Design a binder for this molecule. Structure first.
Ligand SMILES: CCCCCCCC/C=C/CCCCCCCC(=O)O[C@@H](COC(=O)CCCCCCCCCCCCCCC)COP(=O)([O-])OCC[N+](C)(C)C
Ligand SMILES: CCCCCCCC/C=C/CCCCCCCC(=O)O[C@@H](COC(=O)CCCCCCCCCCCCCCC)COP(=O)([O-])OCC[N+](C)(C)C
Ligand SMILES: CCCCCCCC/C=C\CCCCCCCC(=O)O[C@@H](COC(=O)CCCCCCCCCCCCCCC)COP(=O)([O-])OCC[N+](C)(C)C
Ligand SMILES: CCCCCCCC/C=C\CCCCCCCC(=O)O[C@@H](COC(=O)CCCCCCCCCCCCCCC)COP(=O)([O-])OCC[N+](C)(C)C
Ligand SMILES: CCCCCCCC/C=C\CCCCCCCC(=O)O[C@@H](COC(=O)CCCCCCCCCCCCCCC)COP(=O)([O-])OCC[N+](C)(C)C
Ligand SMILES: CCCCCCCC/C=C\CCCCCCCC(=O)O[C@@H](COC(=O)CCCCCCCCCCCCCCC)COP(=O)([O-])OCC[N+](C)(C)C
Ligand SMILES: CC(C)CCC[C@@H](C)[C@H]1CC[C@H]2[C@@H]3CC=C4C[C@@H](O)CC[C@]4(C)[C@H]3CC[C@]12C
Ligand SMILES: CC(C)CCC[C@@H](C)[C@H]1CC[C@H]2[C@@H]3CC=C4C[C@@H](O)CC[C@]4(C)[C@H]3CC[C@]12C
Ligand SMILES: N[C@@H](Cc1c[nH]c2ccccc12)C(=O)O
Ligand SMILES: N[C@@H](Cc1c[nH]c2ccccc12)C(=O)O
Ligand SMILES: *[C@@H]1O[C@H](CO)[C@@H](O)[C@H](O)[C@H]1NC(C)=O
Ligand SMILES: *[C@@H]1O[C@H](CO)[C@@H](O)[C@H](O)[C@H]1NC(C)=O
Ligand SMILES: O=S(=O)(O)Oc1c[nH]c2ccccc12
Ligand SMILES: O=S(=O)(O)Oc1c[nH]c2ccccc12
Lengths: 575, 575
């Protein structure tokens, strides 16, 4: 099935080059004007030769059409609901532009650039026929859905132009002509025509010419994608943001669920293994981020560049953890016990590397800027240090099972002392934000907060250390002392959530602009972890999904540094 | 040995993409400012990743050091002769700048962009160890010769600054520091260092990241090469051009001869087949055009941009026919009788394809511009149609020998009637140029020239048709009637050369600026062809190299259209 062992390097390449593009772009080496030439080259030269070649070589006989109808119907439904509510809710002066552009935003995946390398890694040696579906699903959806949006936007231009229903032919013709002149449709039509005309075989003189342009697309397209995100997120407003929240939730969440349910509803085959693999591939297909061409369309039309560009950037970022978590969630139910144990260990190992590097970057920038010296930033720096110790502890922990038994205990104490400190530090940060905006005079005794933040977890760790019999055969940090450590974590989370929650609601009734959000996102995370803790303790021994629960704790425990890094580290601060 | 059957497709890709870069640039799609961004990506990101990966995997045990030592000594000698004469002849105010850049121009081949794809096509399945030699010879030559040139140019900056031999350390240090900070030297040193440390194996997480950036270099470097040549050739002056003539002959001609002779002198091996292949591979390596990075160095220093940019552009075009002709001449001596026959037929077939398409473009622009209507331009248009028929005739000829015998004769008459006309049209062009610049009154009776240009070859063709017995088993146009056709060609060439030659020398003693040159290059061609004709007729039956002689006629007969297209076709003319 899924060769998920070789999925992480494919996610380290796709976003490693995007990181290189970002670093190069902000380092000011290749400015925006120079970047336009690399965009024109990639978008007008590399992509048409790749599509033309692949369309020439497709063999129209082994394609399972049920998958094709399920995805096209799902995309149509997603387009329909977004357009309907956009027409129903948007303001009268600006309604047709939104109804014409939002449904394209919520349905146009980034399939070639990111989709092809990941599908190839998982599926090249297992079930070779799945790779070819990428070049079939994308063009038909583009052909059938983009012209409608351009029709609506042209209708908006006509309405603002002080007109009527006159020349109903011409709005349709301009939309069709604008769709046809894009360097994608013409070369897809030519490739399909030459597939039948030339009888499925590329001429010898032109194969290498097509391959030279075709192979240069992936790296340069990723690099220009990274270079195009520099500084585009900008400031915002309430209503905009709430729209963005819904649009990204609609795409990433509701598209894959419809795709899987329909695939499960229409395919009727006698092969259970093929049924399972096709359903999983159908789910994984929809998670792909929004295609960068939508922002190009917005720039050319000049009417929603800020919203669409912010949407594409955030959509790209949120998609990275989702593919990993979903992939390992679908491959969990049907395997052995101990290979599952290795699965949880491997996932925790992989996540700790990225969290540690992001934390190191964010902490170094915080330290160098000398901004660590004031009132609120000091507590955040303390929080990040604790998260760093948690990640380092996990890295030291994984290589330990076959080594000195004495080393087990010190690392256990270190891990849960720092994890508890991270929990309490979130509440202390919230309380300090409560105090900072109000409360004149009576400055915060920071020494007291530091003493409480470190002494309390150590005492709790020592209490857990004394009570409990060590289980030497349990290859997991969660069951060294069994029930007693696990019960303590639930109590610790509840105290932190109440302390952090009470202060935050008081602020609303009574740099801030960002700080508050880091508290808000963390509080959402702690609630999810707490429910996982509650389910296991109350329903006997081992719940219906113990592996799923443990995987959730591992993700929310070792990935917090990435969330912190995203807000704080990638900020401009003069050295 | 050399798989030359698959060398033409490799030359249709390398220069096919370069054509796309040229067309796009003049079409104004990607202007000069935008083009700088595509250079920064290729020169600083894709290229450093390609060298670093390959240097890690090299196995320093199977490398034939005799081949390695021969090229480095050969490159040094070419560098030595150019610098010595530059100091002796250059003007005193500008002498140090030229000596620091000219030897670099004549020794820095385009090995990565153009050399590697061609060597792979010929040598991937035959002798796999030849591919690895590209990555050894290129970095060492760059490291040992370029630092010397930057030393000399810096001395000129010091000299013009009114100084002395003071701070001799800093002049040496300035040259060394500038070479090291270039994104080429630093990544070669790191790759060699990590080869021994990590024991020749790339880490799994980083292999795919390097491959994504590495494979994007080949397609994008060629495309950017075409876009940088747009409009750079410029106008010129006398003393400039004569320098350019010598510099290009030094790189392309005298460098490969030294490389082959030394390889024959130092390699002492018992394998004749390996000895033959190694000697042939050494020749083809030096024919590569001047690397585009030299013009980058000229632009940064701002001192010889006009000469060096013109040199690199002209060097690329001349290299294309040279690689093709040289490759098939080394593989001619050692084969069968009848398999050689296909070689002459195949080469003539391949050259006709490129000449026919180029002629169509050049002729079409002339007709549309309505410039065909005046006195001198009219005769050139007559000349180009005649060259077109010769190329058109060869394609019908190759396919017909196994078909209707009657079709043999009509095509035979057609080919030599037009071929003879092409010879005479060259002389008529020269005489008209003689008359145009002088001779007022008494305008040219163009009707007489049109009658003379076509009626005379037809009468000569008819005489050859009657006299001679057809040889049905001779698969070649040159021996249908044996001796009588061959004798006539020599006489026809002599009359044309004398008529064209006499007028041209009269012009010197007594648009022009370009026209004259097309006559001059053609006259050089007819002399070379005539000597080939003379050798065969006077030294019995079949010379020491009959295949070589016949091959020369085929190149100069069907490739004449290519020479004409370069001057006339690639010209700006308002439609
Ligand atoms: C995870 C381990 C496995 C995968 C590893 C694979 C590799 C992973 C590696 C990935 C790194 C990829 C690097 C690409 C380029 C980065 C730089 C960049 O463009 O910065 C942008 C920053 O943009 C933001 O600020 C976005 C913030 C989004 C946070 C979302 C958190 C939700 C996570 C939970 C999701 C659900 C959890 C799952 C639920 C099931 C643009 O910068 P700018 O425009 O200048 O604006 C910033 C500056 N300003 C803020 C001051 C204005
Ligand atoms: C041959 C068949 C097999 C191989 C096939 C492989 C593929 C073959 C395909 C090749 C096509 C390659 C396309 C690259 C881009 C072309 C466009 C371009 O850059 O134009 C440049 C033009 O440059 C010149 O004008 C140079 C003229 C050189 C002529 C040399 C003739 C010698 C040939 C004999 C050699 C020895 C013979 C052999 C002896 C043994 C730049 O243009 P510009 O800067 O605007 O300047 C022009 C305008 N202006 C003039 C008005 C100012
Ligand atoms: C339940 C959610 C369903 C429905 C509830 C929708 C309420 C949205 C309210 C937003 C703010 C508002 O009042 O409108 C503002 C924005 O104008 C719009 O709302 C138009 C934007 C497109 C419509 C919503 C797109 C999301 C579709 C749904 C995605 C479904 C997936 C989500 C479900 C998991 C008014 O703009 P102004 O400038 O003030 O004038
Ligand atoms: C294998 C694991 C991979 C994990 C990947 C995903 C996790 C990593 C993700 C994120 C962590 C890193 C984020 C950096 C992006 C921000 C850049 C930035 O702000 O620009 C700065 C400049 O730019 C520099 O100074 C460039 C620094 C390059 C070093 C990067 C090291 C980390 C790269 C990864 C290697 C890891 C090790 C891999 C091998 C062991 C600041 O710019 P400014 O203040 O706007 O002004 C510019 C100053 N100037 C104009 C004077 C020039
Ligand atoms: C397989 C054999 C391959 C052989 C390859 C090597 C031999 C062929 C080599 C050379 C022959 C062709 C040389 C053309 C280069 C000059 C272009 C030029 O000057 O630009 C012109 C514009 O540009 C155009 O209008 C673009 C025309 C594109 C069509 C090209 C067809 C030939 C390509 C090959 C396909 C062959 C068929 C292959 C398949 C059977 C003029 O520009 P301007 O006057 O400066 O102003 C611009 C006008 N504007 C600003 C209003 C826009
Ligand atoms: C026999 C040929 C050997 C030698 C005869 C060389 C005579 C060259 C005369 C050029 C014109 C002249 O007078 O100098 C002008 C240019 O200045 C130079 O000549 C300097 C340019 C570099 C030196 C020559 C490079 C060719 C090297 C040799 C290549 C060998 C390969 C070719 C042989 C097959 C003066 O410039 P100004 O602005 O008037 O001041
Ligand atoms: C869970 C799966 C199915 C869907 C993903 C939905 C959630 C996790 C996504 C959708 C919209 C996202 C938000 C969109 C916009 C921003 C603003 C940015 O400056 C910080 C991140 C933040 C606040 C994102 C956090 C994560 C987010 C809430
Ligand atoms: C014969 C092999 C080994 C070496 C190649 C040397 C000859 C063929 C080369 C070297 C220098 C070349 C010339 C250099 C510059 C120009 C100016 C350009 O506007 C037209 C072509 C023209 C006039 C070239 C014609 C071909 C040329 C004479
Ligand atoms: N414009 C702010 C909105 C915001 C930040 N923090 C908040 C807390 C509550 C409500 C809104 C916000 C943003 O996108 O970051
Ligand atoms: N500058 C001219 C020189 C030139 C053209 N034709 C000539 C004939 C003879 C002597 C010099 C020339 C050129 O490069 O094209
Ligand atoms: C999928 O195809 C068939 C069932 O349709 C069956 O051979 C098996 O389940 C799978 N085979 C391959 C080769 O994937
Ligand atoms: C070249 O290598 C040796 C001679 O050095 C001999 O086996 C033969 O000539 C060639 N072999 C191969 C494998 O190329
Ligand atoms: O089908 S698309 O995903 O839109 O392909 C693309 C079109 N334009 C692009 C620019 C950067 C990366 C990918 C691009
Ligand atoms: O080693 S080089 O040949 O100089 O590689 C290169 C460096 N810079 C380049 C720009 C275009 C094409 C090739 C290039």
């Amino acid at each position: 099935s899924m060769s998920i062992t070789r999925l992480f390097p494919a996610l380290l390449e796709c976003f490693g080059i995007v990181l290189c593009g970002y670093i190069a772009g902000r380092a000011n080496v290749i400015t925006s004007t120079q970047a336009k030439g690399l965009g024109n080259f990639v978008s007008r030269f590399a992509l048409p030769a790749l599509l033309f070649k692949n369309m020439v070589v497709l063999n129209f006989s082994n394609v399972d059409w049920s998958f094709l109808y399920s995805i096209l119907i799902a995309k149509a439904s997603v387009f329909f609901i977004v357009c309907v509510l956009t027409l129903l809710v948007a303001s009268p002066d600006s309604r047709f532009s939104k109804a014409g552009l939002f449904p394209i935003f919520a349905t146009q995946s980034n399939d070639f650039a990111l989709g092809y390398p990941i599908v190839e890694a998982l599926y090249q040696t297992t079930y070779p026929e799945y790779l070819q579906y990428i070049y079939l699903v994308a063009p038909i959806s583009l052909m059938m859905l983009n012209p409608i949006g351009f029709i609506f936007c042209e209708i908006q231009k006509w309405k603002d132009t002080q007109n009527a229903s006159q020349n109903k032919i011409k709005i349709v013709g301009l939309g069709l002509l604008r769709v046809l002149q894009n360097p994608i449709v013409f070369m897809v039509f030519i490739g399909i025509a030459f597939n039948f005309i030339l009888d499925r075989k590329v001429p010898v003189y032109v194969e290498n010419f097509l391959d030279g342009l075709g192979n240069s697309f992936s790296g340069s397209a990723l690099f220009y994608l990274g270079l195009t995100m520099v500084g585009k997120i900008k400031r915002l407003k309430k209503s905009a943001f709430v729209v963005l929240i819904l649009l990204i939730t609609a795409k990433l969440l509701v598209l894959p669920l419809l795709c899987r349910e329909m695939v499960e509803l229409l395919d009727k085959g006698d092969s259970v293994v093929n049924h399972t693999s096709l359903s999983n591939y159908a789910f994984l297909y929809g998670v792909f981020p929004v295609a960068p061409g939508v922002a190009i369309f917005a720039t050319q039309f000049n009417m929603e560049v800020e919203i669409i560009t912010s949407g594409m950037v955030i959509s790209t970022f949120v998609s990275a953890p989702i593919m990993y978590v979903s992939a390992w969630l679908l491959t969990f139910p049907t395997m052995d016990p101990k290979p599952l144990a290795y699965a949880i260990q491997n996932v925790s190992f992989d996540i700790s590397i990225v969290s540690l590097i992001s934390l190191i970057w964010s902490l170094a920038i915080l330290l160098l800027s000398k901004k660590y010296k004031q009132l609120p930033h000091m507590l955040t720096t303390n929080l990040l240090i604790a998260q760093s110790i948690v990640c380092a502890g996990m890295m030291i922990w994984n290589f330990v099972k076959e080594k000195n038994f004495v080393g087990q205990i010190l690392v256990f104490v270190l891990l849960y002392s720092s994890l508890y400190s991270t929990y309490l530090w979130t509440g202390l940060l919230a309380i300090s934000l409560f105090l900072l905006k109000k409360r004149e005079r009576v400055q915060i005794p920071v020494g007291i907060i530091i003493i409480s933040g470190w002494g309390i977890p150590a005492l709790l760790v020592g209490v857990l250390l004394i009570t409990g019999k060590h289980n030497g055969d349990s290859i997991d940090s969660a069951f060294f002392y069994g029930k007693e450590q696990m019960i303590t974590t639930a109590v610790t989370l509840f105290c932190s959530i109440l302390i952090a929650g009470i202060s935050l609601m008081c602020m609303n009734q009574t740099q801030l602009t960002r700080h508050v959000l880091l508290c808000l996102l963390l509080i959402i995370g702690l609630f999810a972890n707490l429910s996982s803790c509650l389910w296991w303790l109350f329903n006997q021994e081992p719940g219906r999904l113990y592996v799923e629960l443990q995987f959730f704790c591992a993700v929310f425990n070792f990935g917090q540094g990435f969330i912190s890094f995203g807000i704080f580290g990638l900020d401009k601060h003069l050295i």
